[PDB]
Amino acid sequence: WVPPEVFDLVAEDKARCMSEHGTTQAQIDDVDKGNLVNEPSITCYMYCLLEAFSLVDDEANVDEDIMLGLLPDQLQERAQSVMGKCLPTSGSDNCNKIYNLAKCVQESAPDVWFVI
Amino acid sequence: PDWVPPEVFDLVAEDKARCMSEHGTTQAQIDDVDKGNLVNEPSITCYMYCLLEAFSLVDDEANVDEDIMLGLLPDQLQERAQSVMGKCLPTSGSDNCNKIYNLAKCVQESAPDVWFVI
Ligand SMILES: CC(=O)CCCCC/C=C/C(=O)O
Numbered sequence: 001w002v003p004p005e006v007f008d009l010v011a012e013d014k015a016r017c018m019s020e021h022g023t024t025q026a027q028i029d030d031v032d033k034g035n036l037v038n039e040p041s042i043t044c045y046m047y048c049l050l051e052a053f054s055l056v057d058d059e060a061n062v063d064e065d066i067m068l069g070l071l072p073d074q075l076q077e078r079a080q081s082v083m084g085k086c087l088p089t090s091g092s093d094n095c096n097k098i099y100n101l102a103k104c105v106q107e108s109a110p111d112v113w114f115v116i
Numbered sequence: 117p118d119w120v121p122p123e124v125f126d127l128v129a130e131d132k133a134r135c136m137s138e139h140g141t142t143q144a145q146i147d148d149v150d151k152g153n154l155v156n157e158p159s160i161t162c163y164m165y166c167l168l169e170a171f172s173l174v175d176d177e178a179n180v181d182e183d184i185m186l187g188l189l190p191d192q193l194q195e196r197a198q199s200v201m202g203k204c205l206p207t208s209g210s211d212n213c214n215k216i217y218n219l220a221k222c223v224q225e226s227a228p229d230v231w232f233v234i
Pocket residue numbers: 067070075078079082105109112114115116127
């Protein structure tokens with residue numbers, strides 16, 4: 001009757017993305033506080049994490065329906081407005097695209113910061 | 117503008133709180149769900165539904181998106197998850213929440229040693 005091993009999917013996904021990009025816990029902790037920097041070790045992590053959740057494709061194009069689907073009904077119109085300002089993504093590579101997206105979302109809704 | 121510190125919201129934590137409130141789920145029940153101990157009662161099963169739907173793993177008609185789910189699962193479970201979803205999807209049951217109950221039970225029967233929390 002052994003209880004199942006319980007896998008924390010978010011933790012697994014972060015762990016995999018960090019290992020793939022040489023990302024430190026300190027860097028993840030920065031992003032989770034809303035502190036953004038254009039450094040591939042952390043911005044490629046952000047890209048990786050979004051891609052794992054099907055929020056972006058392999059050119060860091062946002063799937064708006066999936067991204068909006070993260071949020072409660074009450075936040076939809078606010079979120080749609082942010083996406084109107086911040087999409088489509090742009091930047092020099094997938095990591096920079098997500099840096100620029102994160103910065104746009106931060107600046108567009110400066111009093112809140114949502115993290116997976 | 118200058119940077120100002122935002123109020124930070126953890127989606128998983130906020131989803132659990134919202135889902136608990138919207139389905140009458142007790143904290144003891146949340147703990148049970150986290151450990152994989154289920155019952156076919158909506159305060160458990162609609163809560164589980166609610167958590168899946170918040171990451172687009174299910175839509176509002178009990179259709180599970182297998183491709184979205186596979187991206188979330190760790191490398192070490194990919195092969196097993198493919199097989200388990202092959203067996204257990206698409207969903208079936210008497211209503212939206214009961215479909216998710218049956219899916220959970222199918223997963224537990226197929227892979228007794230594997231459970232997850234979002
Ligand atoms: C974790 C994540 O990327 C979700 C991004 C959506 C944020 C847009 C919402 C802004 C607001 O509600 O003010």
